Amino acid sequence: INIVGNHAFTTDELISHFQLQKLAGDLETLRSYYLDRGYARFNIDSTQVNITEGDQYKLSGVEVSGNLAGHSAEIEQLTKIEPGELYNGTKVTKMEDDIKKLLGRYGYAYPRVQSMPEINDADKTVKLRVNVDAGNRFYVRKIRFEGNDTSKDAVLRREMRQMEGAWLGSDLVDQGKERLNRLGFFETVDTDTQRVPGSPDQVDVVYKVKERNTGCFNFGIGYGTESGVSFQAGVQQDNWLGTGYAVGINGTKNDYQTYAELSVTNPYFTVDGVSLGGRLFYNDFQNKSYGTDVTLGFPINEYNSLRAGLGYVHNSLSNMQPQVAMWRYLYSMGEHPSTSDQDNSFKTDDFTFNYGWTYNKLDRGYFPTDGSRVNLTGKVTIPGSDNEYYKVTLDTATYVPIDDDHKWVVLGRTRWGYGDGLGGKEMPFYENFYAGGSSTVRGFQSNTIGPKAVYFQASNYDPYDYECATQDGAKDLCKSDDAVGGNAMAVASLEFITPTPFISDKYANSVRTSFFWDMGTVWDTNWDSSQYSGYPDYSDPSNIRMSAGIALQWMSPLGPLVFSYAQPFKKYDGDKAEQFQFNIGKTW
């Protein structure tokens, strides 16, 4: 079988869409192509492929008649086509679907839209006559939910834009569908609009949802006769017992570190969407800190929201090492430690204010395919604090689909941040930014990107540490690999999401695969490159680390796990590589 009888176009322009019931589909595709090219009389006589071709016809205009219950200007605009355009069956179908959608917008749930082109062969033109019957307005009598055997009905009815006892809007139901997808509590959402048997003008709306399991709270204790007892445990949840409250409580206790954190929040404190929540934490590592914060926030439009809150943290340090950056800070604070003398202490009570702004137009909770998200967070100190500073972090991500089936997608992921002191004071060094690891740039050891400490005499560990740590040998300034973090950072990654031809159906909605290229850098400020001219200049922002690789994301029964491998291409002295990485994500 081949293509026979084409003179307007050659077969090389047509066979490219053929697989040579597949043939019936290819023949319908070719017929649609010709109809969309003005060939009003194009058809197929028989399959052997004997083609009959016509000429090209141009549209003369569109007439519309029928039971148009107002909105005539909108219909005219939808059907307004400039004269001279070629006849196109697809355009006609599109116009009919746009009319149906427009009518649905105002409650005409079941319009009847049909059209018939008049083909003028003496003069090659097509005049279209459209017959529209708007029908009656529909009202929603009951809204019901099925499948929600764990979550409370109160949750599903708040993520809705269609109220009972009012006219139907198709877009007002679809918005509900999207908001439920944005909640992140369901595997799938679908809809139905079944007519009420007792009246031609009333319809019910039914949503089908399937909840995924969440939380997976863990615990465990390491133990041995050499290692002793090491306890770690915690619980995390997004939809605790189905009430919509988020909970996070974790902690650990061992012979070198002890800490705990609790964070609880209510996305809907009030009926109109005002949210409240907060957290408490304690972490004593053998330096200690502890504190609390409370945040309130609310929406300002369908896509944007604001947050703000207050809190307090206590920070107490001791036995600090003689680092140049740390001592610069301490001197800026008025401290005068003795050179290379480990005997020291410092503690402050810092009262702060934090705030932020978000935007979220993503289509899915965990595997978005379109849209973008922006998260801008600021933090400032207030009078009465010992450390006067501000910070800003911007985190954005945009998904752009390529494929109609959304298998080919390009993701832009970027993060930037900065911060500084007030009044001529320095930023505390324990608030510095770090990068590297699966959360930022893959292929590098965690918190290894950035400038490193230079060490300068008394210590209780003198004999055991490196020669520049031991105070019998630590006679001068030494370079080290001990990352201290910085006051500025930037990270970016370009990730391509592709099909997964190597997975079975059970993974069809659980496994995503992508290719990526990562870049980023961390740098400082207030770096006196003259005094420390014998070491690298940390103020140079051009030493950007770069790597690329492949990753797979799997929404396993135990939560979102990420497996990846990447290799570096751009590395600077002092960096440490890590080529194979795996982490539990519970983010993105």
Binding site: N213, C216, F219, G222, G224, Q237, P557
Partner: peptide, 24 residues
């Protein structure tokens, strides 16, 4: 040394490092 009871119900012990996970 290790066994599961149901999907997302996992316990291990393996001197030893006892750990348990359970999903809702």
């Amino acid at each position: 040394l290790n066994a599961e009871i149901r999907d997302n119900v996992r316990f291990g012990l393996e001197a030893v490092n006892a750990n348990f996970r359970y999903c809702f």
